[PDB]
Design a protein around this ligand. Structure first.
Ligand SMILES: [Zn+2]
Ligand SMILES: [Zn+2]
Ligand SMILES: [Zn+2]
Ligand SMILES: [Zn+2]
Ligand SMILES: [Zn+2]
Lengths: 157, 159
């Protein structure tokens, strides 16, 4: 639950009352393997659902990070997929990671074969406030052509 | 049900995606009856939950209105409380309208006087984007001191 009151600050001014964060019905993303090399320097965030300095952010949001140990995807604190550097450099240049987070399960794997996919068999849907990234701005065109995408569905009642 | 997609434009920039409108767990309000005396010229809205130019706002929101014909409170197009301006005139000067919108029922009445309580026994909770008003600005201290208030509890986990 979250609360909105009115009047505010001794004033009768109309106020906006948006929901700032929520657990979605579902979240899904397609992440071209190519984005790993489109990150800004000493950055690791391909995609996040909460801003960095958010409270308990890593335990609540969904995060795709790539660094020295390879790629890591967490959702609501559960590790979803884990590829070492070894595992990464072996993936075809045109590989995509498909993420799907839903009440029943969260799965992540290479859009490709099924030997690769990783399931958490439990509800671990992230908290979301938007979509955050540390990818280079100029890389938009390459990565949109490559299939970069995130999609959140929310119920409103 | 709403959607959000990313990237937006042809930009990789981060985006915030707040949920703009929803149906709350509940909405409650206390509206001093002195509020009817304190509307801006030619306006009748004491409190609404959607701005006047939302599509079907009249069908979706909750509105407390006051004009020549008295006071009406509508949510989701259902008239819960009407008070003629005669009925209004016998009320004490400190009277408060109490409203409650929950999924079980929507109640509205003169607080502390359940000879006046009106209860719509369906779920008729409003859609909410905010709290809007054409109450005069200089009325803030008078109305606040009499206990003007609206309160929305929202569920953020969605099924
Ligand atoms: Zn949690
Ligand atoms: Zn495995
Ligand atoms: Zn209706
Ligand atoms: Zn009706
Ligand atoms: Zn309340």
């Amino acid at each position: 639950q979250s609360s909105v009151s009115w009047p505010q600050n001794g004033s009768l001014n109309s106020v906006s009352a948006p929901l700032m964060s929520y657990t979605p019905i579902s979240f899904d993303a397609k992440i071209p393997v190519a984005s790993v090399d489109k990150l800004r320097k000493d950055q690791d965030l391909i995609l996040g659902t909460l801003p960095a300095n958010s409270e308990d952010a890593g335990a609540r949001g969904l995060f795709v990070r790539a660094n020295d140990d390879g790629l890591q995807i967490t959702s609501h604190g559960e590790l979803v997929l884990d590829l070492s550097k070894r595992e990464l450099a072996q993936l075809p240049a045109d590989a995509t990671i498909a993420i799907s987070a839903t009440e029943d399960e969260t799965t992540a794997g290479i859009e490709g074969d099924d030997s690769t996919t990783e399931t958490v068999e439990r509800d671990v849907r992230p908290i979301i406030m938007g979509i955050y990234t540390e990818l280079e701005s100029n890389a938009a065109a390459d990565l949109l052509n490559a299939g970069l995408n995130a999609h959140v569905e929310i119920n409103s009642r």
